[PDB]
């Protein structure tokens, strides 16, 4: 269900608002200015937004005919963009509840928002239109925009009405004198949780205690918080460290476990239930990027399955904040709530108290609950102690939410919240790793013992049986270049970005490349042969290594498939030995034919790697030239990598007729097999014709010289 957006400008703010609501809703958008509408009998776009609807009115007439034809044949709706009251009888209303520009006398439209936003009926021209008067600044306009995307795709681009709010009270028992609570604030906190249990079912506050700085303030405040020792059954609690200290500053698992065990002793002596699988780091230190010892010490002494951070994948914008299941702990995005540690009074809020009243009545709070199914809110003790700011913000937030939305607001315990989060978003179960040094806030979150820039600058992708390990060796000969360490059984393959090794993490990948120094070479590389045909490898490789270079070599795909077939014949694999090559071109036969022929389709893999990496970073050679004259092609690689010093490869690469190749790895790269049969060569020349044609057009598109075998296959 791709959705096509037609922005008026690339820097237009309404395009950022519409794309912002679509990225907050995880709806897969297509950015375009002022194209092909179908993809071989299936619709390419499920919904259209014009950010300027006058583009559609003044459209090209043939293209308008194709647009209206594609809309009526596939049921595609168009969203337009040029006090406020909600229509109770409107079919647009799915999330919006009726509580507290465009004029047509003929009944051909539904006035959903009445002064603004209307829903034109589908029977006028076969297409459905939802038209917007103003932009997406008011919160009711964003509410009816979510309802507009919901109805026009037939609830395909929508979310369920069940909505989930977790409220964390961080910084409990941490403040100095004048910021902590007394008996009045604890009693008002319990009374507020009674009324919010009346509003939201099982709304119980989650409290981030710190046990060291309890019993150290005012004894009147300590007797003021002694009534919270009588109030333990009616409150949820999560550990927020003993001394509110950042977990990456410890950089030892054991002393962090002693701090968490001191908070565990505090939880036992208070009457706190040692349950619920939830805890949050103080400055979110160690959650993204992953400090392994925080994740290990969390589940060791607390059974943490859920944490929540705002650091993934970046701190700002909050629309991009995803969750990820790494190291057995299902991380969730955290939300800011508008409440901070410096806010202790209603009067001393930044921008006045009215700015808080915009944040409650339609700010980051309300669009956070509307656009996210799971919303974990951060509040601090200073918002509960003097003017009771968090009591104010949630007594007004759930009143606003139950007034204007018909959402099923339920507070489950955070294990059920994390299970619901990864049931709704199953694509976010895999983490997407990024560079810790690239964002300096993440580097502050990253531990100081971990050395920066331990990553490759070149990716020698495959495919297999082409000559990639000889190119790996010859790039290893250069003093300015340093090869990767061998990764145990897989050797010079790390197979990080394509397999299950991506779930091991950044620090597993960083161990193969040592610490940069004056003695060690700066430029680093790995040969990664399975990353060619893999679909998951280029996007993750562009995520972690944005400025890396891509080096592919390509030989004749009939001979590549033949050498791959003889490679599994020489590895004594039973299906490839059992059937001859004519039968190849059971499930093992189909798997062998798929990994023998889909690696031969060079264009479909170079499209993925070119969608990830820039074509300046991608360079393609001949491969047979690596067997005939390798010094000129190695001079071309040395010009490609941008190195300063240059090795004269004419004199150090010596031809060996005893091996048949310029030197080498001996028997494994010097195999001698009988030549391909003539009927098999006719079948494999006939099938590798169209793949060679789009391959030749692709290599002319890339600004690359075409190989020899491609030119004789194009001529014959």
């Amino acid at each position: 269900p791709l959705v096509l957006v037609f922005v008026e400008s690339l820097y237009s703010q309404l395009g950022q608002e519409v794309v912002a609501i679509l990225e907050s809703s995880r709806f897969k958008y297509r950015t375009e200015i002022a194209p092909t509408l179908t993809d071989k009998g299936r619709g390419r776009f499920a919904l259209i937004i014009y950010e300027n609807i006058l583009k559609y009115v003044n459209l090209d007439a043939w293209n308008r005919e194709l647009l209206d034809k594609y809309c009526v044949a596939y049921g595609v709706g168009i969203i337009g963009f040029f006090d406020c009251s909600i229509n109770p009888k409107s079919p647009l209303l799915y999330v919006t509840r009726p509580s507290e520009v465009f004029q047509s006398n003929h009944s051909t439209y539904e006035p959903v928002l009445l002064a603004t936003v209307v829903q034109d009926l589908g029977l006028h021209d076969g297409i459905q239109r939802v038209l917007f008067g103003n932009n997406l600044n008011f919160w009711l306009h964003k509410l009816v925009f979510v309802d507009a995307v919901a109805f026009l795709t037939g609830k395909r681009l929508s979310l369920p009405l069940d909505r989930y709010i977790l409220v964390d009270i961080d910084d409990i028992f941490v403040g100095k004198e004048g910021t902590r609570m007394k008996v009045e604030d604890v009693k008002a906190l319990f009374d507020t949780q009674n009324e919010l249990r009346a509003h939201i079912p099982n709304f119980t506050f989650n409290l981030g205690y710190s046990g060291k700085f309890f019993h150290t303030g005012t004894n009147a405040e300590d007797a003021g918080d002694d009534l919270l020792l009588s109030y333990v059954k009616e409150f949820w609690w999560f550990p927020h460290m003993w001394s509110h200290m950042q977990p990456h500053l410890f950089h030892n698992q054991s002393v962090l476990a002693e701090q968490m065990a001191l908070n565990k002793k505090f939880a036992v002596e208070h009457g706190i239930p040692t349950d619920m699988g939830y805890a949050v780091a103080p400055h979110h230190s160690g959650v993204y990027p992953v400090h392994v010892q925080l994740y290990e010490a969390w589940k060791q002494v607390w059974s943490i399955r859920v944490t929540s951070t705002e650091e993934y994948p970046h701190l700002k914008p909050a629309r991009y904040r995803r969750g990820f299941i790494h190291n057995g702990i299902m991380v969730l995005p955290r939300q800011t709530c508008g409440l901070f540690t410096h806010t202790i009074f209603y009067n001393e809020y930044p921008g006045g108290s009215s700015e808080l009243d915009k944040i409650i009545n339609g700010g980051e709070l309300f669009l956070t609950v509307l656009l996210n199914p799971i919303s974990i809110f951060m509040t601090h003790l200073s918002n509960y102690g003097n003017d009771r700011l968090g009591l104010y913000t949630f007594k007004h937030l759930v009143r606003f939410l139950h007034s204007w939305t018909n959402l099923r607001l339920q507070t489950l315990p955070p294990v059920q919240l994390a299970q619901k989060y990864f049931q709704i978003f199953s694509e976010e179960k895999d983490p997407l790793w990024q560079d810790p040094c690239e964002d300096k806030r993440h580097k502050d979150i990253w531990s100081k013992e971990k050395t920066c820039d331990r990553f490759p600058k070149l990716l020698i992708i495959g495919p297999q049986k082409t000559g990639t390990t000889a190119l790996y060796l010859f790039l290893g000969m250069h003093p300015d270049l340093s090869s990767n360490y061998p990764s145990s059984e897989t050797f010079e393959e790390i197979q990080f970005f394509n397999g299950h090794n991506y779930h091991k993490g950044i620090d597993w990948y960083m161990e193969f490349f040592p610490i940069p120094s004056n003695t060690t070479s700066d430029f680093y590389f790995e040969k990664s042969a399975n990353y060619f045909d893999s679909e998951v490898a280029p996007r993750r490789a562009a995520a972690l290594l944005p400025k890396a270079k891509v080096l592919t070599i390509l030989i004749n795909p009939a001979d590549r498939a033949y050498s791959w077939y003889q490679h599994q014949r020489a590895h004594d694999d039973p299906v490839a030995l059992k059937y001859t090559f004519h039968e190849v071109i059971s499930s093992k036969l189909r798997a062998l034919q798929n990994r023998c022929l889909v690696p031969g389709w060079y264009a479909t893999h170079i499209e993925r790697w070119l969608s990830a990496y820039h074509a300046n970073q991608i360079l393609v050679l001949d491969g047979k030239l690596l067997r005939t004259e390798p010094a000129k092609v190695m001079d071309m690689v040395q010009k490609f990598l941008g190195v300063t010093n240059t090795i004269d490869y004419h004199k150090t690469l010596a031809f060996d007729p005893k091996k048949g190749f310029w030197c080498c790895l001996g028997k494994s790269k010097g195999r001698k097999y009988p030549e391909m049969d003539l009927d098999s060569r006719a079948f494999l020349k006939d099938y590798y014709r169209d793949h060679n044609i789009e391959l030749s057009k692709l290599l002319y598109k890339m600004g690359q010289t075409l190989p020899t075998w491609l030119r004789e296959d194009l001529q014959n």
Partner: nanobody, 121 residues
Framework: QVQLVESGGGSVQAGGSLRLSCAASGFNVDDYAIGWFRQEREGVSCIGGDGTTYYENSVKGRFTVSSDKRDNTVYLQMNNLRPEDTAIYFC?????????????????????WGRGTHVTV
């Protein structure tokens, strides 16, 4: 209480220099982003918590933002002043002190703002 107070105004009308002082009362100025926004709001400058400095292309050879920890005040030493520069300059605080080049111009990146002061060029 986080408060941002700014000052500085006028110019030599064909082009001159100023040092707009944004005082950060109630919090530390080396812990936040303190990016300057001119009027919608355009983020022409940003000064990171380690001192890392970003500009737009109109202001890249001209403006010089700076920071001083001692009076807790971020300064904007302006130079070679074009008539397009006249606006309301907003020193805005952000929890991420370090600036990123995609988002140091966005007003949605910056949480707590200032009163704003006018430069007339």
């Amino acid at each position: 209480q986080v408060q941002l107070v700014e000052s500085g105004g006028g110019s030599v009308q064909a082009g001159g220099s100023l040092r707009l002082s944004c005082a950060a009362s109630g919090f530390n100025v080396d812990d936040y982003a303190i990016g300057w926004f001119r009027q919608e709001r355009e983020g022409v400058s940003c000064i990171g918590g380690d001192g890392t400095t970003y500009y737009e292309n109109s202001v890249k050879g001209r403006f010089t933002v700076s920071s001083d920890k001692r009076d807790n005040t971020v300064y904007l030493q302006m130079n070679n002043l074009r008539p397009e520069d006249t606006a309301i300059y907003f020193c805005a605080a952000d929890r991420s002190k370090y600036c990123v080049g995609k988002y140091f111009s966005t007003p949605s990146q910056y949480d707590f703002w200032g009163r704003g002061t006018h430069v007339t060029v």
